[PDB]
């Protein structure tokens, strides 16, 4: 085709001649960047393409695939001509596009076949990643070996659950990916795609039943991730390591209302820990947090936990029973074809959290898994083919509801909400929300929205608090606690005064250190002690009988 003459010229005159945006165009450098990362996905933007010559939108759709041939030949002939060095290794090529116009599901129809397309989707279950065949050879007698391959995985997409046409059925479509654009699909994400429409090579072409069995299939030239949940430093290193940050961060901690300044301190600590320090010869010891509050119907024990979902390095959410399953039964019966059986999510986001309302509602056989993660850093599948475990370097948080009503007074908390004790033995952190009698003007102002920490970094500091500074020490003055053990075992003797232990301060040990995770201290003094005691001093006093002063004189001196 003599036409094929001019096109590559218009490429060749374009990849190594063009300049845009005040020099050193990417095409001079993207290839080598690609070449230095051995990537084979050199990208084009159609907007720049039409900025030069929009003729490549109108001789394209009679066959865009021959257009892509006429792309790859040019690219190849640039790389090995300029990097004949490259002529060893992989030595094949294709390119990418990102016509950056969003168009939508449920519109591709009779007239959208095999033509210039641009669409999105949302991802769900599909298969593994596997290979195929490529070439025309088999004969010599007068071949199933040495016959080059190309990986493969199946897709499944879904559409926005936001922009839905109001009770129109959520829909589904079968689509493809290929080897180089593979191993990036996972459940529950969206991805914007160049897209292109066809059917099977032959989808049941025949006199048949009262309707043909025809399908419709797409693949991507380009995929650009829309979600990207992991990856301007003058703030953090100067502002976010003080103990004034428990105003600064507390200024921006829970931007909903002023209320309950305790948990601002709490959540100022709550995402801020995790430690290995496995001892010698004994076992691995402890690096978990374990928290709950008993709320009320009308409190905020539902709207309790939202803001941290987006921010954390790891987060895993589950509302409790009502639709909680036991999958949270593995005979070591690996998931055979079209047979699927499931297992526990605790290891996913190991060193992440379980975000929970209706914690107290769930099923005990699920609680078995949920418990010993926090106790012996392992849990036990129970007398199936395997008696396997599930690794637990992680944290536990929840938003439960009370027992038998709304809220119990300083009367003990087992009867304020009906968990178990030997599950609570491994529990760490507490706070409580009752209310008797500014906000109304706030609430109506907030109902009139006609329409400090930076928001677009604040993770990577907490990464640094979960990354950087990690001292330990001997007994600074915590031998004091032989009193807090012995005296308050015995002065606060018989009302509600068991729950004082070394695990009652192993809980402290996890976060007294963490003051330096916040501060990058590299050491620990009684400064961080007294603030930790200000948390124990304040959380604990509610969990004991309405003899309430038992904490106050006894510990407010340590405030």
């Amino acid at each position: 085709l003599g036409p094929r003459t001019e096109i590559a010229n218009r490429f060749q005159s374009f990849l190594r001649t063009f300049v845009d945006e005040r020099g050193a165009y990417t095409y001079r450098d993207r290839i080598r960047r690609m070449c230095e990362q051995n990537m084979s996905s050199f990208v084009v933007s159609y907007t720049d393409l039409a900025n030069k010559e929009h003729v490549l939108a109108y001789f394209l759709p009679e066959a865009p695939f021959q257009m892509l041939e006429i792309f790859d030949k040019v690219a190849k002939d640039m790389v090995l001509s300029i990097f004949p060095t490259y002529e060893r290794v992989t030595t094949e090529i294709h390119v990418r596009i990102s016509l950056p116009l969003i168009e939508e599901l449920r519109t591709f129809r009779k007239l959208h076949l095999n033509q210039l397309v641009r669409t999105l989707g949302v991802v769900t279950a599909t298969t593994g990643v596997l290979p195929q065949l490529s070439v025309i050879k088999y004969d010599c007698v007068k071949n199933m070996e040495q016959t080059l391959y190309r990986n493969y995985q199946k897709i499944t997409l879904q559409e926005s659950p936001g922009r839905i046409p109001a009770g129109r059925i959520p829909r589904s479509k079968d689509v493809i990916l290929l080897a180089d654009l593979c191993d990036q699909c996972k459940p529950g994400d969206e991805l914007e795609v160049t897209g292109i429409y066809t059917n099977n090579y032959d989808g049941s072409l025949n006199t048949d039943q009262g309707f043909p069995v025809f399908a419709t299939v797409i693949i991507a030239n380009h995929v650009v991730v829309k979600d990207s949940k992991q990856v301007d430093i003058a703030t953090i290193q100067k502002l976010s390591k003080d103990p004034r940050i428990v105003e600064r961060v507390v200024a921006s901690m829970a931007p909903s209302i002023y209320g309950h300044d305790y948990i601002k301190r709490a959540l100022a600590l709550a995402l801020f820990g995790g430690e290995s320090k496995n001892p010698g010869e004994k076992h691995k010891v402890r690096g978990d947090i374990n928290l709950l509050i008993c709320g009320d119907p009308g409190t905020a024990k539902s709207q309790f936990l939202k803001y941290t979902e987006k921010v954390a390095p790891r987060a895993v959410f589950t509302t409790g029973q009502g639709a909680s399953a036991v999958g949270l039964y593995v005979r070591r019966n690996p998931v055979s074809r079209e047979w699927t059986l499931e297992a526990g999510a605790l290891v996913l986001a190991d060193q992440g959290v379980c975000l929970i309302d209706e914690f107290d509602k769930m099923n005990d056989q699920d609680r078995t898994s949920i418990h010993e993660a926090m106790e012996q850093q392992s849990i036990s599948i129970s007398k199936a083919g395997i008696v396997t475990s599930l690794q637990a370097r992680c944290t536990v948080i929840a938003a439960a509801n009370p027992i038998g009503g709304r809220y119990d007074p300083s009367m003990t908390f087992s009867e304020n909400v009906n968990l178990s004790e030997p599950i609570l033995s491994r529990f760490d952190v507490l706070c409580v929300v009752k209310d008797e009698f500014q906000l109304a003007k706030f609430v109506v102002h907030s109902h009139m929205k006609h329409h400090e920490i930076p928001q677009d970094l604040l993770r990577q500091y907490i990464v640094y608090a979960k990354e950087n500074i990690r001292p330990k020490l001997t007994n600074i003055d915590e031998d004091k606690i032989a009193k807090m053990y012995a005296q308050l075992r015995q002065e606060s003797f018989a009302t509600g005064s068991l729950p004082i232990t070394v695990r009652h301060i192993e809980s402290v040990i996890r976060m007294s250190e963490a003051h330096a995770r916040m501060h990058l201290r590299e050491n620990v003094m009684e400064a961080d002690v007294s603030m930790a005691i200000r948390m124990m001093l304040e959380s604990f006093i509610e969990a004991q009988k309405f003899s309430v002063m038992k904490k106050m004189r006894s510990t407010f001196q340590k405030y």
């Binding site: 449920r106 129809r109 009779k110 769900t124 279950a125 499944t156 879904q158 559409e159 659950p161 839905i164 109001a166 009770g167 129109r168 059925i169 959520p170 829909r171 589904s172 039943q209 009262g210 119907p297 009308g298 539902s302 009502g322 639709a323 399953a325 699927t340 509801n401 709304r406 009698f437 109304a440 003007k441 609430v443 109506v444 907030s446 109902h447 009139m448 929205k449 006609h450 329409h451």
Partner: protein, 359 residues
């Protein structure tokens, strides 16, 4: 349902349609199909069609005038007499259920349920919402289901159906396991066919301990995903609901808490913000209004109260109010704090569980 036989059921029949006819169909409507019955070349039967005939151009009480759109609410000239003269409310208390009598609070309260709610302009961080959770109880032999049945005639998506029959799989679809079409079509349902509509239901009483899994979603989450062998997506509840439980021997004996007078589940009475009961009394002069109304109930001449506001002019004026979007910098809106405060002075006595969900 305009055609309904005895014995027999609305049996099922199956059909295809063209590109411009395609995906232009919604929940329960009355269209005019084409009678081109056609064979299966397997046989068995089928059929086919090519033509359908299912508010800028105006509703009833009009003739063409001007508005924001062509005639969307154009007939202000006749509405407005019935818009502002606030005794018109009494038409909406009197001229709407003239064949019926009960309490006069429901018959002055339901209307805003029928009518749009808040629909404000605020956050992405969280949704704000318009409609409300709702109930009605009493004991039977008090005319407590006439009204629900009437709504199916009165208002759109007034889907009067029983709750006694429904399953927890009443709401969505459940399963397919063979190549029906694609071996996974579990996106059929019962609720979200509320096209700007409500689903009020009878017999919420002996119902199971799973329905709440949807009602928990009612006024915060409004989203629809299933833990089956299919997929999960979500959808938008457009809908409110009605409550239809009842008591054992009926009377809510005024010695024990009204919660305990039935003593049903935990969060249900947090979310439902008004209950609006009518309970029985025995003072028969009460009762002698009734039958002396039904003196014209069979006696076919003007056998009700004289009206003053037709159904169709009512139904048209419903819309005019839903495109105004008030703006509240109300100083009295700032003195709701005093209103709610003197309220809680009354709440202080008689010591229910009260909060801002009631605010």
């Amino acid at each position: 349902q305009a055609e309904l036989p005895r014995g027999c059921i609305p049996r099922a029949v199956e059909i295809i349609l063209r590109s411009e006819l395609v995906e232009t169909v919604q929940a329960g409507d009355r269209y005019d199909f084409t009678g081109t019955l056609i064979v299966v070349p397997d046989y068995r039967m089928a059929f086919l069609a090519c033509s359908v005939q299912a508010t800028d151009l105006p509703m009833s009480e009009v003739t063409a005038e001007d508005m924001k759109k062509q005639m969307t609410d154009a007939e202000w000239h006749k509405i407005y007499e019935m818009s502002k003269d606030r005794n018109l409310y009494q038409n909406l208390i009197s001229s709407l259920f003239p064949s019926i009598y009960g309490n006069d609070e429901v018959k002055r309260g339901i209307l805003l349920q029928q009518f749009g709610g808040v629909a404000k302009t605020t956050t992405e961080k969280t949704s704000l919402r318009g409609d409300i959770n709702v109930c009605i109880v009493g004991d039977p032999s008090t005319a407590k289901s006439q009204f629900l049945k009437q709504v199916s005639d009165f208002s759109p998506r007034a889907i009067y159906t029983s709750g006694k029959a429904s399953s927890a799989a009443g709401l969505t679809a459940a399963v397919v396991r063979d190549e029906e079409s694609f071996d996974f079509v579990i996106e059929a349902g019962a609720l979200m066919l509320a096209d700007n509509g409500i689903c009020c239901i009878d017999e919420f009483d002996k119902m199971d301990q799973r329905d709440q899994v949807a009602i928990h979603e009612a006024m915060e989450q409004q989203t629809i995903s299933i833990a089956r062998a299919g997929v999960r997506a979500t959808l938008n509840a457009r809908t409110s609901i009605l409550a239809a439980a009842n008591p054992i021997n009926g009377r809510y004996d005024r010695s024990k808490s009204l919660q305990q007078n039935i003593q049903l589940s935990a969060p249900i009475m947090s979310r439902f913000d008004l209950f609006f009961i009518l309970v029985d009394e025995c003072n028969e002069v009460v009762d002698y209004a009734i039958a002396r109304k039904i003196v014209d109930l069979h006696s076919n001449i003007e056998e009700s109260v004289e009206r003053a506001y037709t159904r169709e002019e009512v139904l048209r004026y419903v819309t005019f109010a839903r495109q105004f979007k008030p703006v509240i910098s109300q100083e009295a809106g700032h003195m709701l704090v005093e209103n709610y405060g003197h309220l809680r002075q009354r709440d202080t006595g008689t010591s229910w569980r009260i909060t801002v969900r009631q605010l």
